[PDB]
Protein backbone atom coordinates (compact mmCIF):
# COMPACT_ATOMS: atom_id res chain seq x y z
CA UNK A 1 0.00 0.00 0.00
CA UNK A 2 1.29 3.46 -0.92
CA UNK A 3 -1.78 5.68 -0.59
CA UNK A 4 -4.56 5.68 2.00
CA UNK A 5 -7.53 3.42 1.30
CA UNK A 6 -10.60 5.57 0.74
CA UNK A 7 -14.30 5.06 0.10
CA UNK A 8 -16.24 7.16 -2.39
CA UNK A 9 -19.83 7.33 -3.66
CA UNK A 10 -20.76 6.40 -7.20
CA UNK A 11 -24.14 7.00 -8.78
CA UNK A 12 -24.96 5.63 -12.21
CA UNK A 13 -27.47 8.30 -13.21
CA UNK A 14 -30.87 7.73 -14.86
CA UNK A 15 -29.49 8.35 -18.35
CA UNK A 16 -26.76 5.69 -18.13
CA UNK A 17 -29.12 3.23 -16.42
CA UNK A 18 -31.73 3.77 -19.15
CA UNK A 19 -29.11 3.05 -21.84
CA UNK A 20 -27.92 -0.11 -20.05
CA UNK A 21 -24.37 1.02 -19.28
CA UNK A 22 -24.25 -0.18 -15.67
CA UNK A 23 -21.95 -3.11 -16.43
CA UNK A 24 -19.60 -1.11 -18.64
CA UNK A 25 -19.27 1.57 -15.97
CA UNK A 26 -18.80 -0.92 -13.11
CA UNK A 27 -16.19 -2.75 -15.19
CA UNK A 28 -14.23 0.46 -15.47
CA UNK A 29 -14.21 0.88 -11.72
CA UNK A 30 -12.95 -2.67 -11.23
CA UNK A 31 -10.35 -2.44 -14.01
CA UNK A 32 -8.89 0.58 -12.22
CA UNK A 33 -8.47 -1.42 -9.02
CA UNK A 34 -11.49 -0.13 -7.11
CA UNK A 35 -13.69 -2.59 -5.23
CA UNK A 36 -17.47 -2.35 -5.18
CA UNK A 37 -18.26 -2.81 -1.49
CA UNK A 38 -21.90 -1.71 -1.57
CA UNK A 39 -24.45 -1.19 -4.32
CA UNK A 40 -28.19 -0.88 -4.80
CA UNK A 41 -30.60 0.16 -7.53
CA UNK A 42 -33.16 2.71 -6.41
CA UNK A 43 -35.72 5.06 -7.91
CA UNK A 44 -35.17 8.29 -5.97
CA UNK A 45 -38.18 10.17 -4.65
CA UNK A 46 -38.22 13.96 -4.94
CA UNK A 47 -37.35 14.16 -1.24
CA UNK A 48 -34.48 11.67 -1.71
CA UNK A 49 -32.89 13.75 -4.45
CA UNK A 50 -33.54 17.09 -2.75
CA UNK A 51 -31.92 15.80 0.43
CA UNK A 52 -28.84 14.53 -1.39
CA UNK A 53 -28.29 17.89 -3.10
CA UNK A 54 -29.54 20.03 -0.17
CA UNK A 55 -26.49 22.32 -0.31
CA UNK A 56 -27.82 23.61 -3.62
CA UNK A 57 -31.53 23.98 -2.85
CA UNK A 58 -31.58 27.73 -3.58
CA UNK A 59 -29.65 27.45 -6.85
CA UNK A 60 -31.25 28.00 -10.25
CA UNK A 61 -30.24 24.56 -11.54
CA UNK A 62 -31.68 22.71 -8.52
CA UNK A 63 -35.16 22.02 -9.91
CA UNK A 64 -33.93 20.56 -13.19
CA UNK A 65 -31.25 18.53 -11.39
CA UNK A 66 -33.82 17.03 -9.04
CA UNK A 67 -36.21 16.30 -11.93
CA UNK A 68 -33.46 14.53 -13.88
CA UNK A 69 -32.18 12.53 -10.91
CA UNK A 70 -35.74 11.29 -10.21
CA UNK A 71 -36.68 10.65 -13.86
CA UNK A 72 -35.68 6.97 -13.75
CA UNK A 73 -33.83 4.46 -11.54
CA UNK A 74 -30.21 4.98 -10.50
CA UNK A 75 -27.55 2.71 -9.06
CA UNK A 76 -25.81 3.99 -5.92
CA UNK A 77 -22.53 2.32 -4.92
CA UNK A 78 -19.60 2.57 -2.56
CA UNK A 79 -16.18 2.14 -4.18
CA UNK A 80 -13.14 1.29 -2.06
CA UNK A 81 -9.47 1.50 -2.90
CA UNK A 82 -6.20 3.34 -2.58
CA UNK A 83 -6.75 7.01 -3.42
CA UNK A 84 -10.32 6.08 -4.37
CA UNK A 85 -11.84 9.58 -4.40
CA UNK A 86 -9.40 10.95 -6.97
CA UNK A 87 -8.94 7.62 -8.77
CA UNK A 88 -12.70 7.50 -9.32
CA UNK A 89 -12.73 11.07 -10.61
CA UNK A 90 -9.96 10.21 -13.09
CA UNK A 91 -12.05 7.33 -14.49
CA UNK A 92 -15.14 9.55 -14.58
CA UNK A 93 -13.44 12.39 -16.38
CA UNK A 94 -14.44 16.04 -16.16
CA UNK A 95 -17.92 16.74 -14.83
CA UNK A 96 -18.68 18.47 -18.13
CA UNK A 97 -18.61 15.75 -20.84
CA UNK A 98 -17.53 18.35 -23.41
CA UNK A 99 -14.32 18.84 -21.38
CA UNK A 100 -13.85 15.18 -20.47
CA UNK A 101 -10.76 13.34 -21.71
CA UNK A 102 -11.17 10.55 -24.27
CA UNK A 103 -11.81 7.16 -22.69
CA UNK A 104 -13.49 8.53 -19.56
CA UNK A 105 -17.02 7.67 -18.45
CA UNK A 106 -18.37 11.20 -19.10
CA UNK A 107 -16.77 11.32 -22.57
CA UNK A 108 -18.04 7.89 -23.58
CA UNK A 109 -21.55 7.83 -22.10
CA UNK A 110 -22.73 11.46 -22.04
CA UNK A 111 -22.81 14.66 -24.12
CA UNK A 112 -23.88 17.43 -21.70
CA UNK A 113 -23.28 18.37 -18.06
CA UNK A 114 -26.98 18.33 -17.09
CA UNK A 115 -27.16 14.60 -17.84
CA UNK A 116 -23.62 13.37 -17.41
CA UNK A 117 -23.98 9.58 -16.86
CA UNK A 118 -22.47 9.32 -13.39
CA UNK A 119 -21.75 10.98 -10.06
CA UNK A 120 -18.57 10.75 -8.02
CA UNK A 121 -17.86 12.32 -4.63
CA UNK A 122 -15.76 15.47 -4.95
CA UNK A 123 -13.62 14.95 -1.84
CA UNK A 124 -12.92 12.61 1.07
CA UNK A 125 -15.14 14.83 3.25
CA UNK A 126 -18.06 14.91 0.83
CA UNK A 127 -17.70 11.14 0.25
CA UNK A 128 -18.23 10.49 3.96
CA UNK A 129 -21.44 12.55 3.87
CA UNK A 130 -22.71 11.10 0.60
CA UNK A 131 -22.08 7.48 1.55
CA UNK A 132 -23.79 8.01 4.92
CA UNK A 133 -26.77 9.55 3.14
CA UNK A 134 -27.50 6.38 1.16
CA UNK A 135 -25.99 3.58 3.30
CA UNK A 136 -26.04 2.38 6.87
CA UNK A 137 -22.51 1.47 7.97
CA UNK A 138 -23.59 -2.15 8.37
CA UNK A 139 -24.86 -2.13 4.76
CA UNK A 140 -21.33 -1.87 3.43
CA UNK A 141 -19.77 -5.27 2.74
CA UNK A 142 -16.04 -5.63 3.36
CA UNK A 143 -14.24 -8.27 1.38
CA UNK A 144 -13.70 -11.44 3.42
CA UNK A 145 -12.28 -13.88 0.86
CA UNK B 1 -41.91 -8.16 -29.13
CA UNK B 2 -41.83 -11.84 -30.13
CA UNK B 3 -41.36 -13.65 -26.82
CA UNK B 4 -42.88 -12.99 -23.40
CA UNK B 5 -41.02 -10.57 -21.16
CA UNK B 6 -39.71 -12.44 -18.14
CA UNK B 7 -37.85 -11.66 -14.93
CA UNK B 8 -35.09 -13.87 -13.58
CA UNK B 9 -32.75 -13.86 -10.58
CA UNK B 10 -29.02 -13.36 -10.95
CA UNK B 11 -26.49 -13.83 -8.18
CA UNK B 12 -22.86 -12.89 -8.67
CA UNK B 13 -21.37 -15.40 -6.24
CA UNK B 14 -18.66 -14.73 -3.64
CA UNK B 15 -15.89 -15.98 -5.93
CA UNK B 16 -16.72 -13.61 -8.81
CA UNK B 17 -17.29 -10.70 -6.42
CA UNK B 18 -13.93 -11.35 -4.74
CA UNK B 19 -12.19 -11.31 -8.14
CA UNK B 20 -13.93 -8.06 -9.16
CA UNK B 21 -15.94 -9.43 -12.10
CA UNK B 22 -19.24 -7.75 -11.25
CA UNK B 23 -18.98 -5.21 -14.07
CA UNK B 24 -17.88 -7.73 -16.68
CA UNK B 25 -20.77 -10.02 -15.77
CA UNK B 26 -23.36 -7.20 -15.69
CA UNK B 27 -22.06 -5.98 -19.05
CA UNK B 28 -22.78 -9.38 -20.51
CA UNK B 29 -26.35 -9.25 -19.30
CA UNK B 30 -26.85 -5.81 -20.85
CA UNK B 31 -25.11 -6.71 -24.12
CA UNK B 32 -27.59 -9.58 -24.50
CA UNK B 33 -30.52 -7.19 -24.18
CA UNK B 34 -31.46 -7.88 -20.56
CA UNK B 35 -32.26 -4.96 -18.26
CA UNK B 36 -31.09 -4.79 -14.67
CA UNK B 37 -34.25 -3.73 -12.84
CA UNK B 38 -33.10 -4.45 -9.29
CA UNK B 39 -29.73 -5.09 -7.67
CA UNK B 40 -28.09 -5.08 -4.27
CA UNK B 41 -24.85 -6.25 -2.70
CA UNK B 42 -25.33 -8.34 0.41
CA UNK B 43 -23.31 -10.60 2.69
CA UNK B 44 -25.65 -13.55 3.25
CA UNK B 45 -26.10 -14.91 6.75
CA UNK B 46 -26.21 -18.67 7.25
CA UNK B 47 -29.99 -18.43 7.61
CA UNK B 48 -30.24 -16.34 4.41
CA UNK B 49 -28.39 -18.94 2.36
CA UNK B 50 -30.12 -21.92 3.98
CA UNK B 51 -33.50 -20.36 3.26
CA UNK B 52 -32.67 -19.69 -0.38
CA UNK B 53 -31.59 -23.30 -0.94
CA UNK B 54 -34.15 -24.85 1.45
CA UNK B 55 -35.26 -27.44 -1.12
CA UNK B 56 -31.84 -29.06 -0.72
CA UNK B 57 -31.39 -28.92 3.06
CA UNK B 58 -31.08 -32.71 3.41
CA UNK B 59 -28.61 -33.11 0.55
CA UNK B 60 -24.94 -33.97 1.07
CA UNK B 61 -23.72 -30.88 -0.78
CA UNK B 62 -25.88 -28.47 1.25
CA UNK B 63 -23.37 -27.64 3.98
CA UNK B 64 -20.54 -26.80 1.60
CA UNK B 65 -22.90 -24.82 -0.65
CA UNK B 66 -24.11 -22.74 2.28
CA UNK B 67 -20.54 -22.19 3.52
CA UNK B 68 -19.42 -21.01 0.07
CA UNK B 69 -22.43 -18.75 -0.49
CA UNK B 70 -21.80 -17.06 2.89
CA UNK B 71 -17.99 -16.85 2.55
CA UNK B 72 -18.04 -13.32 1.11
CA UNK B 73 -20.47 -10.73 -0.30
CA UNK B 74 -22.68 -11.46 -3.30
CA UNK B 75 -24.67 -9.30 -5.68
CA UNK B 76 -28.32 -10.28 -6.15
CA UNK B 77 -30.16 -8.84 -9.16
CA UNK B 78 -33.37 -9.04 -11.14
CA UNK B 79 -32.92 -9.20 -14.92
CA UNK B 80 -35.82 -8.38 -17.24
CA UNK B 81 -36.25 -9.08 -20.92
CA UNK B 82 -37.81 -11.18 -23.62
CA UNK B 83 -37.22 -14.86 -22.84
CA UNK B 84 -35.06 -13.72 -19.91
CA UNK B 85 -34.89 -17.00 -18.00
CA UNK B 86 -33.42 -18.97 -20.89
CA UNK B 87 -31.53 -16.00 -22.36
CA UNK B 88 -29.78 -15.58 -19.02
CA UNK B 89 -28.93 -19.28 -18.87
CA UNK B 90 -27.41 -19.07 -22.38
CA UNK B 91 -25.12 -16.22 -21.26
CA UNK B 92 -24.25 -18.10 -18.07
CA UNK B 93 -23.41 -21.33 -19.82
CA UNK B 94 -23.66 -24.79 -18.28
CA UNK B 95 -23.85 -24.93 -14.50
CA UNK B 96 -20.67 -27.02 -14.57
CA UNK B 97 -17.88 -24.74 -15.87
CA UNK B 98 -16.09 -27.79 -17.31
CA UNK B 99 -19.08 -28.31 -19.62
CA UNK B 100 -19.72 -24.62 -20.31
CA UNK B 101 -19.37 -23.31 -23.86
CA UNK B 102 -16.55 -20.89 -24.67
CA UNK B 103 -17.48 -17.26 -24.06
CA UNK B 104 -20.01 -17.98 -21.32
CA UNK B 105 -19.81 -16.62 -17.78
CA UNK B 106 -19.12 -20.04 -16.21
CA UNK B 107 -16.40 -20.83 -18.77
CA UNK B 108 -14.68 -17.47 -18.38
CA UNK B 109 -14.91 -16.83 -14.63
CA UNK B 110 -14.95 -20.28 -12.99
CA UNK B 111 -13.30 -23.71 -13.10
CA UNK B 112 -15.52 -25.97 -10.94
CA UNK B 113 -19.23 -26.45 -10.24
CA UNK B 114 -18.93 -25.88 -6.47
CA UNK B 115 -17.78 -22.30 -7.06
CA UNK B 116 -19.21 -21.40 -10.43
CA UNK B 117 -19.22 -17.55 -10.48
CA UNK B 118 -22.94 -16.95 -10.85
CA UNK B 119 -26.48 -18.18 -10.25
CA UNK B 120 -29.41 -17.98 -12.63
CA UNK B 121 -32.99 -19.12 -12.02
CA UNK B 122 -33.70 -22.48 -13.64
CA UNK B 123 -37.27 -21.73 -14.75
CA UNK B 124 -39.99 -19.09 -14.85
CA UNK B 125 -41.54 -20.73 -11.76
CA UNK B 126 -38.32 -20.85 -9.76
CA UNK B 127 -37.51 -17.27 -10.82
CA UNK B 128 -40.75 -16.04 -9.26
CA UNK B 129 -39.83 -17.74 -5.98
CA UNK B 130 -36.19 -16.66 -6.01
CA UNK B 131 -36.92 -13.03 -6.83
CA UNK B 132 -39.58 -12.89 -4.10
CA UNK B 133 -37.08 -14.35 -1.63
CA UNK B 134 -34.67 -11.44 -2.02
CA UNK B 135 -36.88 -8.53 -3.17
CA UNK B 136 -40.10 -6.83 -2.19
CA UNK B 137 -42.19 -6.14 -5.29
CA UNK B 138 -41.84 -2.41 -4.67
CA UNK B 139 -38.03 -2.82 -4.60
CA UNK B 140 -37.96 -3.63 -8.29
CA UNK B 141 -37.47 -0.55 -10.46
CA UNK B 142 -39.24 -0.49 -13.82
CA UNK B 143 -37.69 1.65 -16.52
CA UNK B 144 -39.47 5.00 -16.84
CA UNK B 145 -37.27 6.89 -19.32
Curated annotation (Swiss-Prot), chains A, B:
Chemical reaction(s) catalysed: dZDP + ATP = dZTP + ADP; a 2'-deoxyribonucleoside 5'-diphosphate + ATP = a 2'-deoxyribonucleoside 5'-triphosphate + ADP; a ribonucleoside 5'-diphosphate + ATP = a ribonucleoside 5'-triphosphate + ADP
The protein's name in its UniProt record: Nucleoside diphosphate kinase
Enzyme class: transferase
GO biological process, one term: UTP biosynthetic process
Cofactor(s) for this UniProt protein: Mg(2+)
Record-linked HAMAP family: NDP_kinase
Domain of life, source organism: Bacteria
GO cellular component term, pick one: cytoplasm
Pathway linked to the protein: Purine metabolism
GO terms assigned for molecular function: ATP binding; metal ion binding; nucleoside diphosphate kinase activity
UniProt cross-references to NCBIfam families, sorted A to Z: PRK00668.1
EC number: 2.7.4.6
Keyword Kinase in record: yes
PROSITE patterns (alphabetical): NDPK, NDPK_LIKE
Active-site annotation: 119
Subunit and interaction comment: Homotetramer.
Function field: Major role in the synthesis of nucleoside triphosphates other than ATP. The ATP gamma phosphate is transferred to the NDP beta phosphate via a ping-pong mechanism, using a phosphorylated active-site intermediate. (Microbial infection) Catalyzes the phosphorylation of dZDP to dZTP, when the bacterium is infected by a phage that produces the substrate for the synthesis of dZTP (2- amino-2'-deoxyadenosine 5'-triphosphate), which is then used by the phage as a DNA polymerase substrate.
Keyword field: ATP-binding, Cytoplasm, Kinase, Magnesium, Metal-binding, Nucleotide metabolism, Nucleotide-binding, Phosphoprotein, Transferase
Localization annotation: Cytoplasm
Family stated for the protein in its record: Belongs to the NDK family.
Record organism: Acinetobacter baumannii (strain SDF)
Residues annotated for ATP binding in this entry: 13, 61, 89, 95, 106, 116
Amino acid sequence: EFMAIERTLSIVKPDAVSKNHIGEIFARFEKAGLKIVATKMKHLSQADAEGFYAEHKERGFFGDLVAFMTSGPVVVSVLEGENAVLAHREILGATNPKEAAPGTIRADFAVSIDENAAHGSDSVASAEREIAYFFADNEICPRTR
